[PDB]
Amino acid sequence: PPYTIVYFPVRGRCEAMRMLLADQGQSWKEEVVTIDTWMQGLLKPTCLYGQLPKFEDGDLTLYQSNAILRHLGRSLGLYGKNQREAAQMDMVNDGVEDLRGKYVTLIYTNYENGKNDYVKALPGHLKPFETLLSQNQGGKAFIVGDQISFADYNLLDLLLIHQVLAPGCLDNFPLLSAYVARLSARPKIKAFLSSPEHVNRPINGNGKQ
Amino acid sequence: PPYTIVYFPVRGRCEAMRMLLADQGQSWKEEVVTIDTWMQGLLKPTCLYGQLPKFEDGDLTLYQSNAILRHLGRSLGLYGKNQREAAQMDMVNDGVEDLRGKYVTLIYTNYENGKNDYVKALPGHLKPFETLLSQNQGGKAFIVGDQISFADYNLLDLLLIHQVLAPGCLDNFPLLSAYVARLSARPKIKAFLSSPEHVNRPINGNGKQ
Ligand SMILES: N[C@@H](CCC(=O)N[C@@H](CS(=O)(=O)O)C(=O)NCC(=O)O)C(=O)O
Numbered sequence: 001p002p003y004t005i006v007y008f009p010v011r012g013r014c015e016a017m018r019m020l021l022a023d024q025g026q027s028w029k030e031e032v033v034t035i036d037t038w039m040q041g042l043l044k045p046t047c048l049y050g051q052l053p054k055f056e057d058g059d060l061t062l063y064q065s066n067a068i069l070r071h072l073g074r075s076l077g078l079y080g081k082n083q084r085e086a087a088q089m090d091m092v093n094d095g096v097e098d099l100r101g102k103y104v105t106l107i108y109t110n111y112e113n114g115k116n117d118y119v120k121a122l123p124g125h126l127k128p129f130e131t132l133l134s135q136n137q138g139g140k141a142f143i144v145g146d147q148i149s150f151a152d153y154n155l156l157d158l159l160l161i162h163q164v165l166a167p168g169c170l171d172n173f174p175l176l177s178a179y180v181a182r183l184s185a186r187p188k189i190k191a192f193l194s195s196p197e198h199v200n201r202p203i204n205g206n207g208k209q
Numbered sequence: 210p211p212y213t214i215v216y217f218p219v220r221g222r223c224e225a226m227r228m229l230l231a232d233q234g235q236s237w238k239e240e241v242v243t244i245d246t247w248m249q250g251l252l253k254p255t256c257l258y259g260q261l262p263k264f265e266d267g268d269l270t271l272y273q274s275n276a277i278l279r280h281l282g283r284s285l286g287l288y289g290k291n292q293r294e295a296a297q298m299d300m301v302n303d304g305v306e307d308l309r310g311k312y313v314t315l316i317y318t319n320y321e322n323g324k325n326d327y328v329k330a331l332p333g334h335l336k337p338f339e340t341l342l343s344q345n346q347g348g349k350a351f352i353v354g355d356q357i358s359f360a361d362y363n364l365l366d367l368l369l370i371h372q373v374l375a376p377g378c379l380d381n382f383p384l385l386s387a388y389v390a391r392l393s394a395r396p397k398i399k400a401f402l403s404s405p406e407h408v409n410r411p412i413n414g415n416g417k418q
């Protein structure tokens with residue numbers, strides 16, 4: 001530490017890391033970049049891949065939101081108790097990222113027309129996570145193993161924004177329903193989710209959700 | 210171990226993990242799924258995310274090409290000396306994946322109309338990797354640290370298929386040219402790249418490259 005998140009004034013690819021840090025009792029600085037500032041063209045060329053988020057953990061500057069999440073899971077002890085669990089958490093997080101990639105394309109490039117067929121196809125994309133939870137202690141604990149991991153924070157965020165897009169999307173997924181309810185109730189997550197910084201922040205940058 | 214890779218008969222998302230296993234002196238079994246067998250619809254439902262690669266390591270079954278690479282990186286000691294190196298390697302591997310996703314889209318959805326544009330934009334996408342090498346011992350070692358890691362194999366594969374796509378794309382990138390030359394000369398990689406198994410396997414499933 002200290003931690004600084006540098007990003008656009010949206011939840012986007014940073015709300016899962018904000019929830020992880022809040023639930024682990026960490027504080028961080030938030031360096032908000034407005035679109036006017038980004039468009040001045042001074043900051044983007046110093047970003048490794050020309051994009052945000054940029055994260056500073058003391059000495060270390062990282063780019064790539066899932067690398068930042070795996071770094072926080074590794075350094076705060078949220079990456080499993082053994083290699084098998086670590087491998088399974090990576091498989092989960094990559095499946096989360098594939099669906100987030102599709103979600104982002106819908107929102108920014110084809111919201112109005114594409115929303116119907118997206119929501120129609122969504123049960124098939126959610127079913128893998130329901131299967132993983134049933135295989136792990138009948139769905140009563142975390143997505144992998146007995147303890148929370150970086151992958152739980154990213155899956156929770158993904159499911160929370162899908163419930164804003166399609167309010168009944170978890171009605172046929174009892175373990176995912178109960179999981180979202182359970183994790184949202186964790187004292188420091190419930191507190192973060194009711195915070196004005198979280199609440200005032202748009203999910204995406206173009207108004208759609 | 211034993212190691213088994215279940216995939217379609219193409220290089221695609223499995224050639225970097227085949228080069229990693231070959232270079233670490235491991236043997237594995239190739240279980241090949243043809244496209245006509247895939248289209249029958251019997252195996253797809255048994256895959257967690259409906260997709261391949263599927264990889265078996267003993268009694269651990271994994272999906273997602275980058276979770277398989279990170280697993281092999283963790284279990285064979287190809288993930289750095291410390292936490293700061295591990296995070297840098299995840300940042301590199303996510304940058305590779307981003308460009309790999311762009312390449313897959315070009316190849317499968319827009320080759321004849323988007324190639325020229327993609328190659329025009331490519332230097333801007335390769336320059337981050339050249340900078341990363343210049344920061345690491347002036348580009349004379351690996352992409353992160355002084356030992357090869359899972360991310361070197363993934364970046365090596367990415368650069369090799371882009372030299373087929375845009376011959377001469379590394380011309381203005383002297384450290385990446387040298388890097389490809391050096392890792393390609395490693396005797397077990399050299400052997401793998403000239404094997405008929407590799408040579409006779411198409412890069413992509415649609416015959417373009
Ligand atoms: N793979 C990157 C993607 C980052 C990304 O797409 N950044 C966007 C913003 S957002 O989609 O995450 O909101 C960006 O910086 N775009 C600015 C630009 O490209 O100029 C990651 O995971 O961090």
Ligand SMILES: N[C@@H](CCC(=O)N[C@@H](CS(=O)(=O)O)C(=O)NCC(=O)O)C(=O)O
Pocket residue numbers: 094098217219221222253259260261262272273274275414
């Ligand atoms: N994120 C996945 C992507 C896997 C994927 O795209 N698989 C394709 C084959 S390939 O493009 O990787 O060659 C597939 O199974 N397609 C068959 C289908 O979707 O039915 C990974 O990285 O493993």
